[PDB]
Each structure stands twice: as C-alpha cells, then as structure tokens.
Amino acid sequence: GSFVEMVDNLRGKSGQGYYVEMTVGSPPQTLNILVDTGSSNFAVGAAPHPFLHRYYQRQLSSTYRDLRKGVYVPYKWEGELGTDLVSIPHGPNVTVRANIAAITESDKFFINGSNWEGILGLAYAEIARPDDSLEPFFDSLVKQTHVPNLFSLQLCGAGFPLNQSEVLASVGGSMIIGGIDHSLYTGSLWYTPIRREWYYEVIIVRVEINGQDLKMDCKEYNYDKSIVDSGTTNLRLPKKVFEAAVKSIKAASSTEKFPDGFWLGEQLVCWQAGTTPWNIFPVISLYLMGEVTNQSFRITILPQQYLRPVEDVATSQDDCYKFAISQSSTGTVMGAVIMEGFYVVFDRARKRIGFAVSACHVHDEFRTAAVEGPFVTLDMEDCGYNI
Amino acid sequence: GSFVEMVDNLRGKSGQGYYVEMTVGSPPQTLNILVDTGSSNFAVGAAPHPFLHRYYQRQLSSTYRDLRKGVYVPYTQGKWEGELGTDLVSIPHGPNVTVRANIAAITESDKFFINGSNWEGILGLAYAEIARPDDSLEPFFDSLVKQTHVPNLFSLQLCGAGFPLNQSEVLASVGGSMIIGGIDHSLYTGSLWYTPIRREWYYEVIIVRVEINGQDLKMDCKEYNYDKSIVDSGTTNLRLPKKVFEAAVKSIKAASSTEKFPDGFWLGEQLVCWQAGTTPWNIFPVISLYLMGEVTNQSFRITILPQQYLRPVEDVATSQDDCYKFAISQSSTGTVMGAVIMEGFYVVFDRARKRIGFAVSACHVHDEFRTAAVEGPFVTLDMEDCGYN
Numbered sequence: 001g002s003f004v005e006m007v008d009n010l011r012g013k014s015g016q017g018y019y020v021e022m023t024v025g026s027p028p029q030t031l032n033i034l035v036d037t038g039s040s041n042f043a044v045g046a047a048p049h050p051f052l053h054r055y056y057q058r059q060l061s062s063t064y065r066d067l068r069k070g071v072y073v074p075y076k077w078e079g080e081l082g083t084d085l086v087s088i089p090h091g092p093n094v095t096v097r098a099n100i101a102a103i104t105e106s107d108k109f110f111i112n113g114s115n116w117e118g119i120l121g122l123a124y125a126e127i128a129r130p131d132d133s134l135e136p137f138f139d140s141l142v143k144q145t146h147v148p149n150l151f152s153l154q155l156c157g158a159g160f161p162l163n164q165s166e167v168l169a170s171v172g173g174s175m176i177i178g179g180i181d182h183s184l185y186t187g188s189l190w191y192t193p194i195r196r197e198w199y200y201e202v203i204i205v206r207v208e209i210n211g212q213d214l215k216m217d218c219k220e221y222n223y224d225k226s227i228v229d230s231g232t233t234n235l236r237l238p239k240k241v242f243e244a245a246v247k248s249i250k251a252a253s254s255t256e257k258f259p260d261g262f263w264l265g266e267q268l269v270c271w272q273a274g275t276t277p278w279n280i281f282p283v284i285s286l287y288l289m290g291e292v293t294n295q296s297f298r299i300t301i302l303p304q305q306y307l308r309p310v311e312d313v314a315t316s317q318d319d320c321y322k323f324a325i326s327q328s329s330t331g332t333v334m335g336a337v338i339m340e341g342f343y344v345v346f347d348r349a350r351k352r353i354g355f356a357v358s359a360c361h362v363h364d365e366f367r368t369a370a371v372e373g374p375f376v377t378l379d380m381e382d383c384g385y386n387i
Numbered sequence: 388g389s390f391v392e393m394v395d396n397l398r399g400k401s402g403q404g405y406y407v408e409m410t411v412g413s414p415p416q417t418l419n420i421l422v423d424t425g426s427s428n429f430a431v432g433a434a435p436h437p438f439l440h441r442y443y444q445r446q447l448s449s450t451y452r453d454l455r456k457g458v459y460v461p462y463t464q465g466k467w468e469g470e471l472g473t474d475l476v477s478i479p480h481g482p483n484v485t486v487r488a489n490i491a492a493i494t495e496s497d498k499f500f501i502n503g504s505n506w507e508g509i510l511g512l513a514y515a516e517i518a519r520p521d522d523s524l525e526p527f528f529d530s531l532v533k534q535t536h537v538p539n540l541f542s543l544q545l546c547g548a549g550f551p552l553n554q555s556e557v558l559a560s561v562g563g564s565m566i567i568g569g570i571d572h573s574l575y576t577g578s579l580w581y582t583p584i585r586r587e588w589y590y591e592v593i594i595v596r597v598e599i600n601g602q603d604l605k606m607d608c609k610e611y612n613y614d615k616s617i618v619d620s621g622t623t624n625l626r627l628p629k630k631v632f633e634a635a636v637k638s639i640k641a642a643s644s645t646e647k648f649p650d651g652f653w654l655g656e657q658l659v660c661w662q663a664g665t666t667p668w669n670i671f672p673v674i675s676l677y678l679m680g681e682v683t684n685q686s687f688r689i690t691i692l693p694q695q696y697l698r699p700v701e702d703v704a705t706s707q708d709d710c711y712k713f714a715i716s717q718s719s720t721g722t723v724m725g726a727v728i729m730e731g732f733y734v735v736f737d738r739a740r741k742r743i744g745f746a747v748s749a750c751h752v753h754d755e756f757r758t759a760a761v762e763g764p765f766v767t768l769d770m771e772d773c774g775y776n
C-alpha cells in the first residue's frame with residue numbers, strides 16, 4: 001500500500017452511497033460528498049434543507065466566484081454556478097479551483113441520514129450539466145496539479161446492517177486519487193476498455209449464472225449502454241436481460257420459494273440469525289472485453305454482494321436482505337453492490353477500467369468473488385450497441 | 388362449396404404473417420391473430436408491449452377463468468412467457484359460434500411481436516402433441532370441433548401481392564382467406580391433390596422427389612424429410628435441410644447463371660433490385676416438390692415459380708426499383724413449407740381424413756409464360772422409405 005493517506009477515507013453503504021470529506025472556500029468549509037462515477041457535476045447543498053445539518057455558505061468564502069449562470073438537473077436539484085478553492089483532506093495534498101453548483105432547491109435528492117451534503121461527479125464532461133463546457137472536478141484537478149489522471153475505488157459493504165451511529169464510525173472504503181494501492185485487492189487486475197468517454201462505459205460479452213450461459217445475443221447486455229456507476233445502489237439490467245437473469249436465479253435457488261415482492265427488490269426476506277442460505281443462491285459472472293483482441297475476462301459476484309443487508313422492520317435478531325438486482329430502461333448499471341466485490345481502477349489516462357477482487361468483499365468459507373482470465377471471445381465489438 | 392362470410396377474412400404478408408380477427412372475453416375484446424399451422428397454442432399479448440397497441444385485459448372479462456399455471460415457449464425465432472386460463476372466443480368473419488378455449492396470456496416476450504405486423508397473438512392450428520406445456524392443453528381447433536358442429540377441417544388461401552405493401556396498404560389490402568369447416572371452390576383453379584398427413588403433431592408430409600426446372604436434384608429422398616417435412620404458415624420461407632439447401636442453391640444458381648448475385652443474396656440476407664418492371668423472372672427456375680399421394684405407389688407434384696420464392700421488399704431507397712429477398716433458407720429442423728410456398732396454393736387441412744390438399748391458388752402471382760401447378764399422378768415406388776424415423 002503506497003497511498004496510506006487516502007486508504008480508508010470513505011464512509012457510507014450501498015443503500016445511501018459512499019462519501020469522502022472535502023472542503024470548499026476560504027476559510028475551508030468541510031462537507032461530506034457522495035462519490036459518483038455516474039455523473040459529472042460537483043454540486044453541494046448551499047441553502048438550508050431539512051436533511052442537511054450543514055451547507056456551503058458562499059458569502060463566507062473570500063475566494064467564491066459567481067458564474068452568473070443557473071443549472072437544473074432532473075433525475076432533482078437546481079443550483080447556481082460559481083467556482084471556489086476545493087481540497088480533499090484525506091487525499092492529494094493539493095488545492096484546486098473548481099466549478100461548484102451551489103444547490104438552492106432540491107426534490108428527493110438529499111437522503112435523510114445519509115450524512116452527505118453534496119455530490120462529486122467523476123465521469124466526463126460530455127454528460128456535465130448544463131453542457132460540456134463546465135469542466136468536471138477531476139479534469140480541473142489533473143490540469144492544475146501533477147496528480148496522475150487516474151483514481152481507484154474500493155467500496156466496502158459491511159455484510160450486515162449498520163445503524164445510524166455505526167455507519168458514522170465505520171470505514172466504508174477508499175478512494176485513491178492519482179494511483180493504485182496494492183493493499184486493497186488480492187490477485188491480479190484485469191482491464192476492460194472504456195468504450196467512450198462520457199459515462200464510464202464498458203462492454204459485457206457474456207453472462208453466466210452459476211456457470212450457466214444466459215445465452216442472449218451479447219448486444220442485449222449493453223442495450224443501450226453498460227456503465228460502472230458508484231452513484232446507484234443496484235446491479236441493474238436491461239428489461240430482457242433482467243427477466244432472463246431472474247428466471248435463472250429463481251431456478252438455481254428453487255429449494256426455497258420467495259414472494260414476488262422480493263424479486264421486485266421491494267420487500268425484504270429474513271432468516272434466523274446466522275442461517276442465511278448463501279449456498280442456495282448462484283454466483284453471477286459478467287464477462288468483459290479485454291484489452292487484447294479476441295480476449296475477455298470475467299468478474300464473479302456472490303449473493304453476499306447482490307443481497308443487500310437491511311435491518312428488519314422489527315429490529316429483531318434476524319438477518320434480512322433485499323434483492324439488489326433490478327430492471328433498467330437505460331442499459332446495464334454496475335452499481336454499488338457490484339463495486340463492493342471489487343477494487344475498481346478508473347484509468348482515465350489509458351482509457352481503461354481495471355477490476356480485482358476486493359480485500360474487503362463479503363464472502364463465506366466456501367466461495368469468494370473472482371476476477372479471472374483470459375478467455376477467447378470472438379466479435380466482441382458487435383456486443384456494443386449503436387443507436 | 389362456398390363460404391362467402393369467410394372469404395377474404397385474412398390480412399398480412401409473407402414477411403410478417405397472415406392474421407385473422409378474433410374476439411376474446413366478455414364483453415368481446417377484438418384482437419388480430421396470426422394464423423399458424425406450425426404450432427398448437429392460442430396465445431395473446433396480455434400486457435403492454437412497444438409493438439402492441441392493444442392486448443387482452445383479463446380483469447375486464449367476466450368470463451375469464453384462471454388456470455393458475457404458467458407456460459414458457461422458446462423459439463429460435465421468438466420467445467414468449469405466459470399465464471394459462473380459459474375464456475369465450477369467437478371469429479367475427481368465421482363460423483357463427485362462440486367457444487370456450489384455452490388462452491395463454493403473454494406477459495413477457497423476446498423478439499416475438501414484430502413492429503408493424505398488426506397482430507397481437509397467435510392461433511396454433513396444429514395438434515395437441517406439440518401444445519405447450521404438454522398435450523393436455525387442448526388446442527383451439529380441437530375445442531371448436533368438440534363444442535360445435537363445425538366440420539373437422541379448415542383451408543387456407545394466403546395471397547402475396549407480388550409487390551411491396553406499405554404500412555397503410557397492408558392494412559387495407561385483402562391478404563387471403565381462412566375457410567373454417569370447409570372448402571370454397573372460388574379460391575382455386577384445377578383439381579385438388581391430396582397427400583397423407585404422416586402423423587398428427589405438426590402437419591407432417593412426405594416429399595419423394597425434388598426438381599429444379601425439371602432436373603432431378605437426385606438425392607436420397609430421405610434427405611428431403613430429415614428429420615420431417617411440414618406445412619407451416621407461421622414462418623416466411625421455404626426452408627430446406629442443410630444438405631438439400633446446398634444442392635438446391637447450387638442448382639438454382641446454375642439455372643440463373645446469366646446474372647451473378649452477391650453471396651448475401653443467396654443467404655437471404657440482402658435484397659436484389661431491378662429497374663421497375665424488368666425483374667428477369669425467366670432466368671430463374673421453377674421448383675417442383677413431389678408429394679406422396681393417397682393411392683399406393685402414386686405421387687403428385689406442386690410447382691413453384693420465382694414469383695413465390697423471391698419475396699418482394701421495399702428498396703432501402705423507396706425508389707421505383709422492384710426488389711426482392713431470396714425466400715429459401717437452410718433448416719436444422721427439416722423441410723418447412725412456409726408462407727411463400729403457401730402463397731402459390733389453396734391448402735386444405737383435412738383433419739377428418741388425415742390429409743392435406745393442394746390446388747393452384749386463384750391468387751398466386753405469375754407471369755404470361757408460366758404458372759404454379761399441382762399435377763399428377765406419377766408412379767413412385769417405396770415412398771415410405773422417404774420418411775425419416
């Protein structure tokens with residue numbers, strides 16, 4: 001581990017997000033910021049909100065600069081654009097002037113009890129709002145300092161429910177800015193190409209449930225795109241893929257019958273303390289395009305990743321979970337529960353994303369998550385979707 | 388001899404299928420249903436789908452009965468997931484009867500419903516042996532015959548227009564006739580020749596000889612029926628077993644050799660266009676399929692023109708050129724006489740006498756020099772050896 005100052009700098013969980021501490025303004029105003037590889041705007045609460053116990057106060061920063069431009073981002077938050085000096089206390093020892101969207105109005109954005117007051121969009125300018133002329137934070141960081149154009153994320157799910165006090169005192173993972181820390185993973189790093197620089201887009205070429213090929217035209221897996229998104233909780237799949245995957249997961253776990261509400265990801269299922277039947281649920285393997293022509297590799301997750309720990313509505317001693325795989329109308333999304341199984345390297349400089357088994361992934365004595373390769377795979381370019 | 392209330396009750400085309408109007412539930416819910424002699428399930432869209440502008444709403448039918456059982460039907464050419472039940476069904480332009488039939492309410496489907504075909508369901512007219520999930524689910528036609536006095540027989544006249552039909556034309560055009568319970572003599576010319584239904588599952592028949600412009604393909608006749616030969620209104624092309632397809636394409640290429648076409652054409656994937664009105668029909672050969680007759684050692688033949696095996700398609704430029712796709716393709720499931728072959732003939736599915744009849748269609752496309760034909764008899768020996776076991 002060569003980046004000890006950034007190791008363990010994250011807090012949070014898959015259901016509400018993982019955040020890093022940042023400071024904005026002069027003198028520095030400390031705020032907790034959601035790490036989101038699925039968006040490209042740095043935006044912070046800048047006005048009182050029932051779910052915020054602190055926010056960015058522009059009139060108290062001597063380095064605040066008003067851009068005299070508004071921005072509306074519906075998913076929903078509205079803000080006022082400006083720039084200010086920004087730092088990451090447990091990160092690179094540098095201060096940069098970055099664009100900041102001061103959130104003045106929001107609907108269903110700030111989550112009661114998540115502990116974050118803003119969002120750090122780490123994707124590319126092409127999807128920045130209002131348009132690509134608003135330089136994203138990481139682009140500003142790299143242009144203004146000597147920090148290498150790469151960051152890596154280790155998101156650590158606890159494997160069990162964390163109450164409001166525990167989630168504030170618990171280490172949720174690491175965001176290494178400008179490098180790769182070898183203590184955060186085991187085995188080798190396998191890289192898949194970033195197809196296009198907007199979202200962190202990748203190409204899935206094969207899907208297996210307990211080794212059984214889902215057998216779908218691989219274009220279906222990336223319809224209309226496949227991205228790595230730390231700002232989303234679930235592994236989400238295109239309608240047709242979700243329907244085929246749920247049917248296969250139900251068949252593999254058929255020794256136990258679960259209510260439709262469970263497979264819809266809406267209702268929790270509980271087992272007597274310590275008896276969760278992990279072994280009846282299948283592992284899921286996603287094969288990704290490799291960097292070598294006709295070569296692919298696979299990442300395999302366990303039900304310990306796709307079943308999300310939740311506190312029983314009775315706070316009992318039962319171990320409960322919600323199914324963390326859901327249908328998508330916007331393509332495949334490898335959300336937080338999938339990233340919790342791996343150390344993910346966003347190698348912007350080499351236009352590639354690396355995956356390695358996470359040193360903090362939850363597993364049991366019989367199975368572990370995996371990143372394995374290589375596999376000979378043909379015509380993988382045809383797996384990509386073109387509008 | 389004449390069923391005027393059923394004449395012209397079909398719409399559609401070979402590329403997307405021919406459908407008949409049906410009603411399901413109480414009060415009646417109207418739906419366009421694909422006529423398919425290649426399957427045995429009555430299944431209808433029962434949930435929103437981007438290619439469906441209407442679907443069966445079970446909660447609005449007072450006569451809907453839930454069978455509490457699912458059914459999953461996967462086809463390399465389409466897949467659908469459904470919930471089984473029964474309801475009252477009628478065919479507005481068919482027998483004046485109402486039947487309680489099994490209905491698979493389709494809730495999930497993959498590549499089954501096609502954009503712009505205008506049908507929201509499928510009527511499987513074949514036998515119970517191939518009904519899903521098993522033969523205990525009585526097919527619609529079996530229910531119809533058991534519940535009414537309708538004769539156990541139906542006939543199909545599928546009419547190809549000979550040219551592309553645009554989105555509004557195909558909805559206003561008469562695509563043919565499905566005569567339920569009989570035979571209408573105005574739909575064909577000449578005599579009807581019958582071939583035995585070998586076994587009641589698919590409508591299985593036996594081909595005993597194949598000719599391309601009179602030249603015998605000369606293959607062991609068992610190759611033509613490997614592993615079976617069926618009449619299937621549910622698929623577009625004339626499909627031939629790999630070995631037969633390769634020999635047939637070599638012969639059709641040799642007969643049409645005065646003009647060279649890209650391999651993509653012979654793969655049925657790319658169109659070929661000619662200036663308006665100049666399609667060189669005459670350079671393409673007729674294809675003759677000899678079928679086992681009902682008389683011992685007797686066979687007859689049906690002859691198809693390129694006007695049947697070259698399928699009219701609109702040019703990617705909408706130009707005034709006349710364009711087509713080659714409608715003969717390779718099969719791994721035996722010989723399939725699909726829609727383009729049925730467009731040449733009036734086909735009688737005589738279930739009561741376990742036989743299929745063929746007659747030249749009064750609506751088949753041809754030119755002034757050649758016509759489709761159904762002719763016999765021919766002395767043919769050992770025709771039972773042509774069947775695959």
Ligand SMILES: CN(Cc1cccc(CCc2cccnc2N)c1)Cc1ccco1
Pocket residue numbers: 013014015016017018034036037038039075076109119229230231232233336
């Ligand atoms: C839902 N999270 C909050 C939230 C709310 C609105 C927009 C965004 C970012 C934009 C976005 C929208 C939709 C999908 N992904 C995204 N990155 C994030 C919390 C979270 C992070 C990880 C898991 O839970």
Ligand SMILES: CN(Cc1cccc(CCc2cccnc2N)c1)Cc1ccco1
Pocket residue numbers: 400401402403404405421423424425426462464465466498499509619620621622623726
């Ligand atoms: C391909 N048609 C739709 C469609 C799709 C999947 C299964 C089925 C029915 C089952 C079947 C499968 C394969 C061959 N024949 C069949 N009857 C029909 C449309 C059509 C009919 C005539 C020409 O285009």
